[PDB]
Design a protein around this ligand. Structure first.
Ligand SMILES: COc1ccc(S(=O)(=O)N2CCCSC(C)(C)[C@H]2C(=O)NO)cc1
Ligand SMILES: [Ca+2]
Ligand SMILES: [Ca+2]
Ligand SMILES: [Ca+2]
Ligand SMILES: [Zn+2]
Ligand SMILES: [Zn+2]
Length: 169
């Protein structure tokens, strides 16, 4: 694994997230599940717990966007940059933006929202890219992984616990 520079990490175990908008590519219900499951992944190996807001500024603001969308890094159309996110911190920090010029699916017939969400949310949590090929934090986008056999890799578990520790009990 690999954390960020100056090793940013939230100074609190409980984080709030908010889904700011919805992609026309999937039923609102599928977008919710992906985010909740992307969150389960990390929540299971650390003291981190999460809750949802429907208003106010949440730590982890999630949203879909196209091209220019409010920051300095406009999205680039279909493919290539799938989504980007920010390290822990105030305001735009911790937020995750998804490119809608991608076709977000619940399976692998395009860009799986879960798989890509878990990885972006690790960013919000403070993890940078991993050199480990079998790691979820690898800049790894592969459409050949059954969803069925997915499991966070020891590399991912190592790096996030480096920051927050193992589960309390
Ligand atoms: C499994 O999770 C993911 C999430 C994003 C990408 S990506 O294709 O958008 N991307 C890899 C390819 C270069 S661009 C990037 C730096 C913005 C980077 C990425 O990991 N965003 O955090 C790939 C796999
Ligand atoms: Ca934020
Ligand atoms: Ca793109
Ligand atoms: Ca789309
Ligand atoms: Zn953005
Ligand atoms: Zn990434």
């Amino acid at each position: 694994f690999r954390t960020f520079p100056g090793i940013p990490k939230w100074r609190k175990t409980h984080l709030t997230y908010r889904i700011v908008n919805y992609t026309p590519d999937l039923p609102k219900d599928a977008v919710d599940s992906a985010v909740e499951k992307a969150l389960k992944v990390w929540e299971e190996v650390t003291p981190l717990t999460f809750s949802r807001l429907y208003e106010g500024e949440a730590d982890i603001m999630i949203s879909f966007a196209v091209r220019e969308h409010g920051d300095f890094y406009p999205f680039d159309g279909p493919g290539n940059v799938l989504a980007h996110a920010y390290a822990p911190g105030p305001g735009i920090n911790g937020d995750a933006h998804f490119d809608d010029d991608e076709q977000w699916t619940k399976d692998t017939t395009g860009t799986n929202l879960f798989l890509v969400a878990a990885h972006e949310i690790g960013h919000s949590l403070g993890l940078f890219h991993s050199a480990n090929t079998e790691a979820l934090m690898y800049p790894l986008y592969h459409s050949l992984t059954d969803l069925t056999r997915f499991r966070l890799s020891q590399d991912d578990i190592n790096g996030i616990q480096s920051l927050y520790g193992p589960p309390p009990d």
